[PDB]
Design a binder for this molecule. Structure first.
Ligand SMILES: *[C@@H]1O[C@H](CO)[C@@H](O)[C@H](O)[C@H]1NC(C)=O
Ligand SMILES: [Ca+2]
Ligand SMILES: [Ca+2]
Ligand SMILES: [Ca+2]
Lengths: 298, 306, 65
């Protein structure tokens, strides 16, 4: 209610005590703020990192010292640019360069020539992603000056059962020859030599119509199969088609593994199959294709 | 004296209210900073599995099958190591390499010269439970890298922005080049077309004469608050276009637009909000005027094919 | 002007200055806190109410006159 005009001198001298105090605190606050700004300049930590160790291939790298699987940069001797890959390094010190992977169906494999040439999908440090490295890369790797390579095919059903098929002298040719697939011989494996053909009984030429050694790569937009029609298209994928296949790892990913002829408007057997192991109406749950210098495959 | 002495008391009561009020707002702020300091004892994280397909830049990648907009790895030139970048493969026929992106204020842009040289921010982040980072983070690729990409060959620049009301306009530059560091990353643009307003080449629409001219960025040099290379030729340390907390840009005297300005929430901001009263902040005068901070701002480049 | 009536003129401006200074600190802190979003585990969700600052300012410009 308006007090003595004699208090004003203390009251006035009071608002000053809480004024300078305020400015004081504000200064320390700003300091505190400077410190906060410092703890906020960095970017989020990316779990996925790439190792520095490089080489002509995973083996070359593994030998150099790398000991764990993970993404790496390799550059085969004749390659222009270097390119990222997924290396698998076991205890024995074998660097496997993986170029094909299936495990969930998240990645569509109904791609064209270019994409199959360049590669698609994602690379992951924990080999938990699906992909196709790219015909050109695979080619470069498998045809390094005087280095016999070996291809291992690992399968796995919807029951935790795995199998492997190995091929010695694995090779993939240049685009001039449509990335022709070739190998010297089936180097063994409980998975079964599906690349040699398989007799179904539908025709007397089955074996002939389903062999893969020597077959050129095909995609819907680039027919190179031994069929008057289009294998890659019908199955909706990219692969070394004959007429059409006995072993087909880039097939449609049928969840459950078990599919039938009543799965398409044509009854095609366009799944992830490998005749020697399971029936043609069983699409694998996992699929991995890796290579490594033959002179290392035990 | 008599009644004027009545202001004094009612006056003391006022200030008393404020000084004790602020002293509390301070208390609030202090509390707030201590909390954020604790959340910073640990970082944010990402898991960006790298796509297989790669190339010299986004254009080559899309021509190689990369059709989805996400983070890619590119090796512009064989001398330098491959680096992550975000590729816009949908906007106007895709093949756009993002070199600058603003959208939420998650990243600080008021950095020194070195960081604008190397790059900073977050390129990409993981989208709704996915092993690949399909959304772009806020970032500046880094002067060196931008200089190299634009020189590789004829490069066009696409600038996109959005206001806090959902509106969108674009700024296109048929020709865009940024020189190397020795040349202070001097910028050159041309062949405009768009709806955002040609602020880089012409200058602020609101200005006239030498004023609308001294706000022209084309031909300017790059400056950061710790490295003056602007149009202001004087010794007055108080006239520099880039002050603390301000971003690095191609400042003149001083700007028509600043994609690298402070991220003010809401859009409109005033002189008593700005650290220096100067108007830093994601501006593009030719469309929203002088004191408006965009909600989204991005800079994308693509090899120019006539 | 008497001594006391002159010590007030000083404060009025002082607070007006400290108000602007706080208004600024407020925005600065908001911007910086948000910029921790891209570096730290999380960012303190907040919202500044410039309104109170906008009121205390006028409320003070009037009493100064
Ligand atoms: C340039 O700026 C000065 C100072 O603000 C002003 O006096 C002059 O009128 C401006 N030029 C224009 C746009 O007329
Ligand atoms: Ca055919
Ligand atoms: Ca800074
Ligand atoms: Ca200067």
């Amino acid at each position: 209610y308006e007090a003595s005009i004699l208090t004003h001198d203390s009251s006035i001298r009071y608002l000053q005590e809480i004024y300078n105090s305020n400015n004081q605190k504000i200064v320390n606050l700003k300091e505190k703020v400077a410190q906060l700004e410092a703890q906020c300049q960095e970017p989020c930590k990316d779990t996925v990192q790439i190792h520095d160790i490089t080489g002509k291939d995973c083996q070359d790298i593994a030998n150099k010292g790398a000991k764990q699987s993970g993404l790496y940069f390799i550059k085969p001797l004749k390659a222009n640019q270097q390119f990222l890959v997924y290396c698998e390094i076991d205890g024995s010190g074998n660097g496997w360069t993986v170029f094909q992977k299936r495990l969930d169906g998240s990645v569509d494999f109904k791609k064209n020539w270019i994409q199959y040439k360049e590669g698609f999908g994602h690379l992951s440090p924990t080999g938990t992603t699906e992909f196709w490295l790219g015909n050109e890369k695979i080619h470069l790797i498998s045809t390094q000056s005087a280095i016999p390579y070996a291809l291992r095919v690992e399968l796995e059903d919807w029951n935790g059962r795995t199998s492997t098929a190995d091929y010695a002298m694995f090779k993939v040719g240049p685009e001039a020859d449509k990335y022709r697939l070739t190998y010297a011989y089936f180097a063994g494996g409980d998975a079964g030599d599906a690349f040699d053909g398989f007799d179904f009984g539908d025709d007397p030429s089955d074996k002939f119509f389903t062999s893969h050694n020597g077959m050129q790569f095909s995609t819907w937009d680039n027919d190179n199969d031994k069929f008057e029609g289009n294998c890659a298209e019908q199955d909706g994928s990219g692969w070394w088609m004959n007429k059409c296949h006995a072993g087909h790892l880039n097939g449609v990913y049928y969840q459950g593994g078990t599919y039938s002829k009543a799965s398409t408007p044509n009854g095609y057997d366009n799944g992830i199959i490998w005749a020697t192991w399971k029936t043609r109406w069983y699409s694998m749950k996992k699929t991995t294709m890796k290579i490594i210098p033959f002179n290392r495959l035990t | 004296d008599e009644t004027v002495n009545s202001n004094i008391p009612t006056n003391l009561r006022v200030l008393r209210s404020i000084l004790e009020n602020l002293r509390s707002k301070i208390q609030k702020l202090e509390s707030d900073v201590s909390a954020q300091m604790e959340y910073c004892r640990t970082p944010c994280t990402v898991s960006c599995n790298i796509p297989v397909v790669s190339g010299k830049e986004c254009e080559e990648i899309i021509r190689k099958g990369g059709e989805t907009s996400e983070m890619y790895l590119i090796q512009p030139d064989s001398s330098v190591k491959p680096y992550r970048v975000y590729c816009d493969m949908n906007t106007e026929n895709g093949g756009w390499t993002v070199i600058q992106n603003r959208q939420d204020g998650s990243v600080d842009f008021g950095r020194k010269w070195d960081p604008y040289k190397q790059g900073f921010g977050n390129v990409a982040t993981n989208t709704d439970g996915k092993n690949y980072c399909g959304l772009p983070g806020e970032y500046w690729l880094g002067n060196d890298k931008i200089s190299q990409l634009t020189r590789m060959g004829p490069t066009e620049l696409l600038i996109e922005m959005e206001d806090w009301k959902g509106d969108k306009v674009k700024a296109h530059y048929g020709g865009f080049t940024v020189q190397n560091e020795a040349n202070k990353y001097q910028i050159s643009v041309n062949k405009y077309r768009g709806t955002a307003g040609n602020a880089l080449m012409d200058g602020a629409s609101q200005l006239m004469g030498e004023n609308r001219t001294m706000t022209i960025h084309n031909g300017m040099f790059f400056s950061t608050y710790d490295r003056d290379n602007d149009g202001w030729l004087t010794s007055d340390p108080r006239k520099q276009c880039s002050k603390e907390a301000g971003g690095g840009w191609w400042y003149n005297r001083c700007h028509a637009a600043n994609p690298n300005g402070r991220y003010y929430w809401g859009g409109q901001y005033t002189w008593d909000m700005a650290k220096h009263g100067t108007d830093d902040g994601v501006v593009w005068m030719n469309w929203k005027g002088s004191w408006y901070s965009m909600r989204k701002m991005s800079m994308k480049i693509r090899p120019f094919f006539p | 002007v008497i001594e006391k009536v002159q010590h007030i003129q000083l404060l009025q401006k002082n607070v007006r200055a400290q108000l602007v200074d706080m208004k600024r600190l407020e925005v600065d802190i908001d911007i910086k806190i948000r910029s921790c979003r891209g570096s730290c585990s999380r960012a303190l969700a907040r919202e500044v109410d410039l309104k109170d600052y906008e009121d205390q300012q006028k409320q003070l410009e009037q009493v100064i006159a």
